[PDB]
């Protein structure tokens, strides 16, 4: 290690196109991260590359933390989590940049 953290934030409002995912995010919102892990922004020249890594690193950490407590994510959770983390990673790239 390590990775850099972002500050905890309010989990973002997201209008998912898939209606059932839209409702599922709201019902189960607290299952998802409210902060991101990443490699330093100044190691990237492009938002898209930063966000890709920020998503992979954050989802990895969150899934590992969850599995070792004996909890689980559904396939739906994973789809939503990736979107939520993407948004927070973008916010982190833009703020931090
Ligand atoms: Cl929240
Ligand atoms: Na709930």
Author numbering: 126 to 222
Text taken from the publication that reported this structure:
Pathogenesis in prion disease involves refolding of the host protein, PrP, from the monomeric, primarily α-helical cellular form (PrPC) to a β-sheet enriched, aggregated infectious form (PrPSc). Additionally we found that rabbits, a species with low susceptibility to prion disease possess PrP with a helix-capping motif in the β2−α2 loop, which appears to hamper the formation of the β-state. In the previously determined structure of wild-type rabbit PrPC 121–230, the sidechain of S174 forms a hydrogen bond with the backbone of N171 and vice versa, creating a hydrophobic staple helix cap motif. To test this hypothesis, we introduced the single mutations S170N and S174N as well as the double mutation S170N/S174N into rabbit PrPC 121–230, successively changing the rabbit sequence in the β2−α2 loop to that of wild-type hamster PrPC.
